[PDB]
């Protein structure tokens, strides 16, 4: 075909998702697990339970062993703190570069520009099962189209980047995704964005996408009405009990639910980890004081806190943003625990 | 799984639609010309002026043959100033929801007859270049350009999604231009990387002719500028040419702007494109060698009209964005035509 | 894995579909004969069925030509039969030489079967538009997306009548389907297949989408033998009687399809004259179970070996019966269904 | 078009069962071994016999698990005169219409389950080869070898496919050794013209294990042999074995014969299986070389049952010898084998 491929280097195979799938099927166990947490998310949404949905984990999964063993630990917090957060592991193996960088574990799990996407995919697939097998539900960014259709069974709430929230090609995903999905607000703070975001992935869609098998095919989606803002911060933080404000009215005035999500990382804390204790005492005391429109909040803690260049590497430290470690990941949710005993 | 999701239909492969409608050896010739007299204004080897004209989108292959026509007229008589390529945008984004354009839904009903769109769309384009004149796309989906890029000469990436790493990496493998928007609401950085990011090789999973998902490596496309659209307020004016220039050098890249005097930059107020066409043409005729492109939204008949109605469309008229008639439009060219002409001097 | 040397892309059925549709004369010339083929099984009708045209196709400029020919012929002994041209791309053999116009359309073992395909169905299309209803060889389970909706009558090759995999697709086609007596002359392998393939069927086969699925049959009641002889001839009035017979002891229709070429002639294309002056006096003579008749015919009689340009029309595969040939045996056909009424 | 298809369904490719199942370090060693040792074997370097033997048809995981192991041990106690290869065959060529086997039918129901049918096949495949002992079967389909080819070590084209073009296409292309049936009339020229075609290489239309359609190219197959297994009258005895050496000569093949004590060579009375092995086994013990293997219908219990609930180790196919049976045969095998030597 002429005037076609120019640009194109090499065309090489993908397994398709049902191979996946047969490979690695949902057990019983992480099947309920996915179910519930979307069940406990929904009513959460619906404003008919008081407890606060908590997304916390690495920024990003590079090593399946430390990623378990961080489950683990938070799967004793999860079932200590159940009667006031809903706790679900960020795992994150898909991340948006401000221009070129290491895309994740799916892409390059080497981490060597070796690109085994493949293998990557089973890697990526593999740990959701065994975390959701062990009863932790799981949080993943949706950056690209075909990914999902890999992983999104076993997922239980999902993020749109704020690089995407505006794109109508992830809103048409949302409106077909069967977790809850959280819009974040424009990397310069624009909370416009997101509610349209919410908006249009509330309604139904007719659009290209790939199936099961592999195949391109047209979809038609009923619209998702479980989604919601979360607040990212843009060139200045936005999780005060003024911004938190100025946001319920807008939902209002768009017609929406006046409930936030409020990201304690990223822009909230000005990409220092440690201020994301600050965010917590924060938020922390507009939950006690009654603030019922936050919904959730949003942490990057790891084994190890902080960060290392991918220049041996750490055990159970982020490669991509800076962390949290676990003794402040302790003492922070049991504070939003009793953040939430007191609003009730 | 699949909660959401309520019915799955079978699409054509790209295969399909390229043995249906083969590029003649006319319109194979119109996009390899044309992609090749871009690319040389690109790296400042001619001093042309790059114009993407034509409808907010296209709704009806009879009209939009009638308006190419016309542009193709033009296109000839204007050649030695002007690269004329016709505006021939089958998707859309939308703010919120709306029609998606001929492509998702070409009986506009809500039918999202798909498989007759493409069919209707690679005809039109096929026709289009078949004729003589280049045409330009905003390329939004990731999977309809397996079906129309190879009878495209210049892409657009839109302001909503010129943050977007897939939007990036497809352009990272196109054949032809790509011109990025700024962001809606007047940011330059975001543009500024995604130059950057489209030049560079990317490996991503995207679909074959053959409609099947595959993973695929880019070399890069070095073809690719930025493209000034407004935000807040407009910015096509001296003052903001200037400093996307220095922001454009500062980031390594050359100093070279397309200006589409159409959405934020006429605060969507379609006559006032003449307006900043006056304003364009004086930078240019007074000296200014930075901006290589402009876009203009040009259609048969001035303004636009509602599907919603439910009252028959009339003939040659936007049903998306208001635009220019004919008459502004053959006034437009020579003005743009007359200016780089008093640019060389 | 390590016999299989390479692995090329193929279009998919539905790119061929798209890019040659039928036309609304190429729709209805296939609806009616698939029609008029049905009423003559049924024995509703007593016209004869004449498949009649090149062993293979090399040259779909000779092969309009013969359609033209042929088409008049159609029109003009409409009332006695219903001509349906041989339109055949490989000559099913053990390896020799030319794999057919699909497999190899160039002739030159450059193997370009994406344009065979399109050079295939490209024909089949013409032929059907002109108002001429097509016959194929069903040789291959892939092949037949792309041109069976062209398609109004079609045959399983002798070498492959047992096999369950060519009964299975027979099963699920929309047109009647031929099913010739073994290379050795047995009628049992036929009359097993003319039964496995009226049943329905589940087996695995690629869809129009070039993707392997699995597909449902309702089975094939438009089925019959096509006597094509054996060690010796076998469409004399005794072997006619005798598949009668076993046709009967079956709970099948005693009715058969004879060609006049391959084993029946001796492969002599000559001698197929003298087994149409033998089946004409059956038919004259009352014989209503030859419900049809195969015959190999070209433009030009005789064949010719691929080296080098080639004479115009004339087979490169089995030798046929040229078009003077043709036209007299098609009257004579034609005065013996008279005859018969 | 299509209106003869009911119903399309969708079909894992092959992808996901290789995915699913993928090959044991063992499984891989017990292949690669046995395929091998075949090798040898056909190559006149090994004075051994090939034994294929095992259930006409599978269609109990649990019973023909126990079956390999019993043979497993016979495997391993006899290595030094047999080479031992369990019939697993997952697909059955019908007379005209039946059960076609468990790929096809899991559940036996006539619900046509595949999708269930290959993970289950291709599980019981691994299973038995990575307990170490090899497998065989029937390469009847087109498109399921790509789900289990990897796990076979030896392979059969059936008497009614032998004569198939696209079977011939196949063999030409597997990894694995292929014996070809004479005709079900017990012609032996099909067959070896059937060995001929696939020790070339071919170009055809395949099904990938992306469960795409393809154009693919093969090398050729140079392990094929003939399998014996009577016609009209039976063809094991050294008159036959004689005619077969020389025709095979005729044709520039190796003088070497497999011979199947089942199906029209028993006249399909499974006890006459011990009749055609004293036979047999008189040709090895008088030192006949050219018998290099032989084919067996055994099952745990002797016999065959109707398909109302089903008894166990029976088969529902074509009556075998019990394992009483099974044990002694495989004995006088491996004893004639040292006689010979
Ligand atoms: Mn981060
Ligand atoms: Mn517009
Ligand atoms: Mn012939």
């Not at 062993?65 to 703190?81: D, F, M």
């Not at 990914?147 to 069974?153: F, G, I, N, R």
């Not at 509610?195 to 391109?216: E, Q």
Request: with cysteine; proline share 4%.
């Amino acid at each position: 075909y002429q005037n076609d491929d120019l640009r194109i280097k090499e065309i090489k195979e993908l397994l398709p998702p049902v191979a996946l799938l047969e490979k690695f099927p949902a057990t019983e166990n992480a099947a309920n697990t996915v179910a519930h947490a979307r069940k406990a998310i929904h009513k959460i949404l619906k404003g008919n339970d008081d407890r606060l949905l908590v997304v916390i984990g690495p920024c990003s999964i590079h090593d399946p062993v430390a990623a378990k063993e961080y489950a683990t630990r938070l799967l004793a917090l999860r079932e200590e703190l159940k009667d006031e957060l809903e706790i679900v592991m960020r795992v994150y193996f898909e991340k948006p570069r401000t221009t070129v960088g290491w895309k994740g574990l799916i892409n390059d799990p080497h981490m060597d520009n070796s690109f085994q996407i493949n293998d990557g995919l089973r890697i990526a697939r593999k740990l959701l099962l065994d975390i959701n097998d062990s009863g932790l539900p799981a949080a993943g960014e949706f950056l690209d189209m075909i990914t999902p259709q890999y992983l999104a069974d076993l997922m239980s709430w999902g993020a749109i980047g704020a690089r995407t929230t505006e794109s109508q090609v992830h809103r048409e995903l949302a409106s077909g995704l069967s977790c809850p999905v959280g819009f974040k607000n424009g990397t310069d703070g624009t909370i416009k964005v997101a509610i349209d975001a919410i908006n249009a992935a509330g309604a139904p869609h007719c659009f290209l996408s790939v199936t099961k098998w592999g195949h391109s095919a047209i979809v038609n989606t009923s619209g998702n009405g479980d989604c919601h803002i979360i607040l990212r911060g843009g060139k200045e933080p936005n999780y005060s009990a003024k911004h938190v404000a100025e946001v319920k009215e807008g939902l209002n005035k768009a017609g929406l639910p006046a409930q936030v999500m409020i990201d304690f990382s990223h822009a909230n804390s000005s990409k220092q980890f440690k201020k994301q204790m600050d965010v917590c005492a924060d938020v922390c005391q507009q939950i006690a004081g009654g603030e019922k429109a936050i919904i959730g909040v949003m942490v990057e803690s790891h084994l190890v806190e902080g960060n290392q260049s991918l220049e041996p590497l750490a055990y159970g430290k982020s490669i991509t943003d800076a962390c949290i470690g676990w003794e402040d990941t302790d003492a922070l949710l049991r504070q939003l625990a009793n953040a939430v005993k007191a609003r009730r």
